[model samples]
Target chain A: MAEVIKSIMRKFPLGVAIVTTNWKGELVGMTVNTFNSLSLNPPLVSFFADRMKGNDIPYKESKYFVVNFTDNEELFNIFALKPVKERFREIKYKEGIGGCPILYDSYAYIEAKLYDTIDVGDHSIIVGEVIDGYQIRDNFTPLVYMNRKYYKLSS
Target chain B: MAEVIKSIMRKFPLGVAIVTTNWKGELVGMTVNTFNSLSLNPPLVSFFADRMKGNDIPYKESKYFVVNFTDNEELFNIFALKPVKERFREIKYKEGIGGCPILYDSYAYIEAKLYDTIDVGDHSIIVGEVIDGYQIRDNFTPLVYMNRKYYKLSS
Candidate 1:
């Protein structure tokens, strides 16, 4: 049953997001498709990242981070790279209000303060409060990830 | 800038899910729109619920719960009422393998064990390992909540 349900979810499409946090003076980020909008009253959103691999991106300690919602063009730039480390270097971005790296020319971006983290199996679910951020272009289409593949928005 | 992004996300539709857990034979559930699939390899999914007035449904202690992906027909039955008592009475459900209430005709369902949770601002991010679940009907379309209203699948 678990496998069957998983197979269904694998086909489920999700918008891609890049989570960026300032680790000391260095900017670190990883592409995540687990992102979702949490609330509207207080303005909140969240995403999950693996912890068992010991990536230790210092999310717990970081007070603020930026969630960059990628456009279709940016999706190619993100998935084209091999190692995640190389992808981070290849991506062009600017410093956000919270000093986190904000991917420039993306569909939209949200700067949020760390609100909570929940350990679920092998991943850590991180929730954030949107303090500041903006939409660059509403005309641009979003990138969706599904079944280990990238998909562009369709009308 | 943040306001603009918020406005945009307001239009972005999302599926509604009711995460229910049994505490000493008592059923507790919370209506959420922040649910999303996190990982395929580890069989993980997550959702964030506000810690505000209608958002407190305890589960960490129970460690097991059912994520009911609701359909349009069940919207008013689930979210229209106050989540205090008798929420379960509105829906036809049975005990799942994990001992959680499985709604009779949901779009899909997932029985999971609480993996981790984090307190972020006015919300808690909960991640769970998908232990068991199945799709009851492929023809059933998921109910989407968007712009403060329920939307039917156009496709």
Candidate 2:
């Protein structure tokens, strides 16, 4: 049943992002393909973190996080492939809300306060209330992921 | 604040999907770019529906919904542009769990039982536990949405 579900998901493409948080002065980041828009009026965004990994703990403890979007494939790969605790040394960043590290010159970035975290299965859905955001690039393109590979959009 | 958030989201690309459910013999579905994989061990998936439209009600009442994926541009456009009650007649489908209509020959499909719904601002995050799923197309390409337009992936 799990494999069947994974197979179905592989067919769907998703935009990639790196979610960062500062937990008691300890910086942590993880790559997420589950990043998405949740609401417009109050402005919310969401992503899933593996509960088994204890990844949800940092966001919940810190009470804030930043969702960073970039077309930089190297940055995406760094978060996806490196140890979570070691990612910050490779990137340039500055502190945002909740002292969360926001990558400099992202395609866009969202500073959010941890709104809610709901546990389900092996993962927890982390919902963030958008406090501030900016689009650094006027013409932007996303790094897409599908079927376990990276891609770009074409007409 | 809302405009700033929207500007950031516009830069992120998302795969398109239609979430279908049956409520007292009436069929309802709405286009969603927020559909995503939530878990693998317990097999869960999620999508968000606008609370303003009362779209979350059908899935809550029915206790079942099907996530349909396809590369069909016309189908994507139909759901995006047509009235929710008027979409069924335009596509061919068969009943699945809880009599939810599942589109035939989708890139993939998943039948799920309603797991949870969390309200945030003007939207509700709908979580579904996967009961059954299948990959209809071994090689699939997704219809992508970004910057308010449709696209396909490129290398």
Candidate 3:
């Protein structure tokens, strides 16, 4: 019991985020867990995308993208599994400061302009400058991802 | 109250880690909150360090380092504040597979060789390929840093 208690709470719980950008006028997005704040002085943040050869993940060609921390897990999975056209067909979203798609009622969103990129094995370390950001709902309860499952913060 | 909750839950919490490297045989370490798993095909993981113009952080001269997820807060504060020399004065550490300092009682530790790096505004995004890793104690409650506070997972 003690061992279980000791081992159970260890995890790197992160907010489940969806990154959106227009790739040559096409709305593209992907569910991600690699996003994090980098520096405070310049309001910069970053995330890693699976740029594995030819997966066709967007934001590669675009100069701007928006990172949205969503509240719904079902919606997150829909985007993760469906094609780009089907994912955005029925979902309600709006254009960000740079015209990137921002999912409605997300916990919070940060519209950013691509500032830098680096190749790390099979992932692209995307650094962005926060152009606009704010919370969409009050008393926000974040959707966290871990161990192939989704969890929420307890109030 | 609405703004407080909105701002509060947007943070993405990560594992609090202590990164140590042997700078030409001298032991060095620092408290960090930017640790993350980068890629898995080759077992890569990484963290960011404050490498601003004025901050004289170590690990810049070394090609190998160890990321330790410790199980205490007192040690975190000590390394986060004390001078480099004072921090390692009689601390319990062993030479890791990468020849870096590995602290005792760590939930898990990763011994890695530098893979790539990029200048991230005021920080350096240091990516490493894990050469060796393990959990010292099982069922660990990870130490997390968020909102200027340390929180643990709920059982």
Q: Choose the strongest candidate by TM-score.
A: 2
The sequence of per-residue lDDT tens digits that candidate 2 reaches over residues B47-101 is 9989998988888788899999887878888888998768988899899888998
Candidate maximizing lDDT:
2
Clashing pairs in 3: A6-B139, A6-B140, A7-B139, A7-B140, A10-B142
* DockQ values, each candidate: 0.23, 0.78, 0.26
> What lDDT is obtained when candidate 1 is compared to the true structure?
0.67
How much of the real interface does each model capture, measured as fnat? 0.15, 0.86, 0.22
lDDT tens digits, residue span A24-90, model 1 = 7667777776667766666777777777654435677788888776665554556434565576567
In the range A60-80, model 2's lDDT, one tens digit per residue, is: 888889998887888888988
Full candidate order by lDDT, most accurate first = 2, 3, 1
lDDT of each: 0.67, 0.85, 0.71
Model 2 residue B70 CA deviation (Å) reads: 0.7
* Candidate structures ordered by DockQ, highest first: 2, 3, 1
DockQ of 2: 0.78
Clashes of each: 8, 0, 5
**Per-residue alpha-carbon lDDT of model 3 for B93-126, expressed as tens digits?**
7887647888886777777888777677777888
Superposed model 3: Cα runs more than 4 Å off: A1-11, A53-57, A153-155, B1-10, B53-57
